[PDB]
């Protein structure tokens, strides 16, 4: 199914490409042809056309293809530089987290998890679902995006609904829930 195959591509492209004989470039890209061969190690009926279709109809925009290269657009557990086009338009963004993080955040702003990017959402609902990954007691931080831009931070369009930024100073957090 597209769900199973996409789950496997997400794992390969974000977390364990070398286990499959793939070597991503600095931007997280691998050969889509080698990705097909890798995926076929698990799902032998997968075609390059199928993976291109998964990318095209992925509801979150998780993936990006350029010529023969394919990457996950965000969520990597290894070093990548992501030169996504800038979100210049959003005025308020959202960050899902858990209540016990508030103390730390109120001290030092939102810092990345070594990832070098903080994940924000354009929608409260998706920020909430994202925060639910780290526990049940979820709070959603309202983020002033103009405040971020004024301080010099560039907000990038990582996915259809995901936005990434280097850091969120306390000053730019305007509300909770
Ligand atoms: Cl393997
Ligand atoms: Cl990321």
Among all ligands shown, which has an atom nearest to the Cα of 40?
1
Q: Distance (Å, rounded) from C-alpha 67 to C-alpha 75?
A: 22
What is the per-residue DSSP string for 143-173? EEHHHHHHTTPPPEE-SSSEEEES-B-GGGE
CA-CA-CA-CA torsion sign (161, 43, 82, 114): positive
Q: Distance (Å, rounded) from C-alpha 97 to C-alpha 136?
A: 10
Give me 171's structure tokens.
């000053």
What is the per-residue DSSP string for 4-65? HHHHHHHHHHHT-SGGGT----TTS-EEHHHHHHHHHTT-TT--HHHHHHHHHH-TT--EEE
Q: Is-contact 51 70, C-beta < 8 A?
A: yes
Identify the CATH number of the domain in which residue 110 sits: 3.20.170.30
Q: Distance (Å, rounded) from C-alpha 96 to C-alpha 81?
A: 23
Identify the CATH number of the domain in which residue 62 sits: 1.10.10.970
Among all ligands shown, which has an atom nearest to the Cα of 80?
2
User: Do residues 66 and 107 share a domain?
Assistant: no
The environment of the single-atom ion ligand 2, i.e. residues with CB closer than 5 A, is 74, 117
Instruction: Tell me, yes or no, whether 87 lies in a domain.
Output: no
CA of 19 to the centre of ligand 1 (A): 5
Number of folded domains in the chain? 2
Instruction: Tell me, yes or no, whether 156 lies in a domain.
Output: yes
Domain of 103 in residue numbering reads as 92-176
Helices 2-14 & 32-40, crossing angle to 10 degrees? 120
User: Do residues 112 and 166 share a domain?
Assistant: yes
């Amino acid at each position: 199914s597209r769900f199973k195959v996409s789950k496997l591509m997400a794992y390969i492209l974000r977390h364990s490409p070398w286990e499959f004989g793939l070597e991503p470039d600095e931007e997280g890209f691998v050969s889509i042809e080698e990705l097909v061969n890798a995926v076929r190690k698990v799902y032998p009926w997968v075609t390059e056309e199928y993976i291109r279709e998964i990318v095209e109809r992925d509801e979150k925009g998780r993936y990006e293809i350029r010529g023969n290269k394919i990457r996950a657009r965000y969520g990597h557990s290894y070093p990548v530089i992501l030169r996504h086009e800038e979100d210049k338009e959003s005025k308020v963004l959202y960050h899902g987290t858990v209540r016990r993080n508030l103390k730390g955040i109120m001290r030092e702003g939102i810092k990345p998890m070594k990832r070098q990017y903080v994940h924000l959402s354009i929608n409260y609902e998706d920020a909430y679902n994202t925060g639910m990954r780290h526990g049940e007691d979820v709070v959603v931080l309202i983020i002033d995006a103009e405040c971020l831009r004024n301080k010099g931070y560039k907000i990038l369009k990582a996915g259809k609904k995901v936005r990434i930024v280097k850091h969120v100073p306390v000053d730019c957090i305007s509300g909770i829930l």
